[PDB]
Amino acid sequence: TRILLGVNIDHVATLRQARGTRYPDPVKAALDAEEAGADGITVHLREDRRHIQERDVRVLKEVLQTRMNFEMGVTEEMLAFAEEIRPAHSCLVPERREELTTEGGLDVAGQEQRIRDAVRRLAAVGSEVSLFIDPDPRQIEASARVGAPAIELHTGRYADAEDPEEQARELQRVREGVALGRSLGLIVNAGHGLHYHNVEPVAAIDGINELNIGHAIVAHALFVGFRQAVAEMKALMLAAAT
Amino acid sequence: TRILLGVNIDHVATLRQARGTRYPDPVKAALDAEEAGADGITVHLREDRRHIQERDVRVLKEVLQTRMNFEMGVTEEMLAFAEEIRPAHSCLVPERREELTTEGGLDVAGQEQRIRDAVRRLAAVGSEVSLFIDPDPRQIEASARVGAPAIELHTGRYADAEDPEEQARELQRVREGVALGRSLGLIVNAGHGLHYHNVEPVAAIDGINELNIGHAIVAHALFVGFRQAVAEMKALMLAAAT
């Protein structure tokens, strides 16, 4: 079927934590996003609790009309929490120096057994697990070995490209990443760093399943509202994927 | 005349610094705010550069259709910056431990001479200077002594009140604060911590000049957009003040 949009609401909480109030509620933003056509809601509970809190995830579990994509760093605390939450989707991301690559993706190749156990525990809970990795053939192949059904390609370097030539190279890496992943039977996602003026070439890639976009949508929502921001982003993706 | 709305755009930059992009641009929000009926734009350039940058203030100077309210801590580096920028309005706020009172306002009484010089220097540049103080008789009277034309009352405690009885007391402090200030010939402002569900009793206070509101407007803008968020807040204030 068509390309899918997952809306990450972390930076709604970024705004909330700035003053330590109860608003803006990331829960409300999540419900607005679904109402505006989001296919899923993505939430990242960090160990440092920078934005999203446990309260956020627990309430989301009770109110979501679609499905949760629970982003987490691989620790015992987060795994146990996820086993409680039972999210439909989950995504393992790097938060600590040891699990980080230079580009920013999860070093699955460096920690294969550790990731495999995490994938197994999450899958046993019914969660479809994704691994947030760089568009690196070596990380993609490792991701397939550890038994993850899906990967999300790090589109950061594509988004951070200064000259058009550099962006073309980085877009080509993502393109090659998708082709490789699907050849290994993986579901391939992306989304980091994407905004309303660079999303279309990524959404145009054949075989892309879901784009998980957060910050740019939240940023745009400041001007048009969350409902319109989500709808506009989805429409861009659908028109580009055609 | 009628009550005035100053829109503080600090936390648009908060959302920007989270990912270090150019979006969301506080400049765009400010221009949206003016277009939506804001009477002035408030911007706080901190020493630690937590959100707003030098870029923000300088661009605002070039694009504002109304007037800038430059919030700043009193330092030599910052006073000179203000003397170049020459904002129509300025507001002296606490940033360092020694100038903070327990309630959070600027300890004008403790540093009268230091503040007096700051007011004089800014006034010489044509700026209407405001002092961010607690709704305390001793700070209000000190502010009049140092020659500042205006004060802004810290409405944080009123906003932070847990039980209705506490809120009634804190509102009374603000009410008495306004009365005292105007008796000393001061322009009296407020706005900190105010949101769409507690602003009206404050806007209803006789003699209130301008409310400077930031975070709550930014938070609400996530759902309805900055233009509608600004307009909705102003209408509440106008209806309450009449």
UniProtKB/Swiss-Prot annotation, chains A, B:
Pfam families: PdxJ
EC number: 2.6.99.2
Assembly description: Homooctamer; tetramer of dimers.
Site features described as Transition state stabilizer, chain residue numbers: 152
Positions annotated to bind 1-deoxy-D-xylulose 5-phosphate: 10-11, 46, 51, 101
Species this chain originates from: Pseudomonas aeruginosa (strain UCBPP-PA14)
Classification of source organism: Bacteria, Pseudomonadati, Pseudomonadota, Gammaproteobacteria, Pseudomonadales
GO molecular function list: pyridoxine 5'-phosphate synthase activity
Keywords tagged on the record: Cytoplasm, Pyridoxine biosynthesis, Transferase
GO aspect biological process, one term: pyridoxine biosynthetic process
Domain of life, per lineage: Bacteria
Amino-acid positions noted as binding 3-amino-2-oxopropyl phosphate in the UniProt annotation, renumbered to this chain: 8, 19, 193, 214-215
Record has Transferase as a keyword: yes
HAMAP family noted in UniProt: PdxJ
Protein name, UniProt field: Pyridoxine 5'-phosphate synthase
NCBIfam families the UniProt entry points to: pdxJ, PRK05265.1-1, PRK05265.1-3, PRK05265.1-5
Compartment annotation: Cytoplasm
Entry function: Catalyzes the complicated ring closure reaction between the two acyclic compounds 1-deoxy-D-xylulose-5-phosphate (DXP) and 3-amino-2-oxopropyl phosphate (1-amino-acetone-3-phosphate or AAP) to form pyridoxine 5'-phosphate (PNP) and inorganic phosphate.
